[PDB]
Design a protein around this ligand. Sequence first.
Ligand code: HQT
Ligand code: ZN
Length: 257
Amino acid sequence: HWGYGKHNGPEHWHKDFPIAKGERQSPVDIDTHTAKYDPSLKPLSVSYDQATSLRILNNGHAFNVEFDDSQDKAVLKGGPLDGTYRLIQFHFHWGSLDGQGSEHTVDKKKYAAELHLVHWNTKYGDFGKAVQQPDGLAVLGIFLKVGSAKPGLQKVVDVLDSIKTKGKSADFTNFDPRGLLPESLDYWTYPGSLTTPPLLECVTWIVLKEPISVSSEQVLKFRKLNFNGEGEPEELMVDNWRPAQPLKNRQIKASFK
Ligand SMILES: On1ccc2ccccc2c1=S
Ligand SMILES: [Zn+2]
């Protein structure tokens, strides 16, 4: 099945998921000089005050922090979006080395990791119906660079040892995702896709310009996770990023001059 190795990595995914070579795949390189400022964009509204985390799961590809999305609680609106999108989970992509790991790149620059906060358009009722729609999802993407620690990340780092291997989950209540956000909400936006199979073309991507800093020790702990299940030969969960895909007939808009 799919993964990030030589035999089942991104260059193979198109055989099971032909949309891998579609018209609006993600990630992409953000060419800052070519992204035009769009003064009709609204500021982004991130309202995470009532977010309710439930659990953290090692899915064999990444770890997901999952939210109760049964009520209207943690929503993204404004920016390029029409209507209200509800937070359902976040996860990260990261490298084996600090010089790589992000999926989007900025003028070809790779960051050490990238956080994806996934939200679904509440006009479609739930996540499963939203991923059948071209405007079903909005993913807030945030780059990580290695430097000072991010205090708001530590509770996630500290729980990873309890979900080392594929299929493990742990209670993860009362986690506040506001602690993972940078100061500025300046962003680039474009239409794209999930960056993992099934690679569905549902996503309005909103990529923040300002990275957050995490410490070398924090990202080292992400790299101790495993892609394998318990009892299987250890394969470290590193380099779970898809490289940039062709922009095709898309424009990337900037919210800032
Ligand atoms: O990586 N990843 C995994 C699951 C998912 C689900 C909805 C939207 C985006 C994603 C991504 S980027
Ligand atoms: Zn992702």
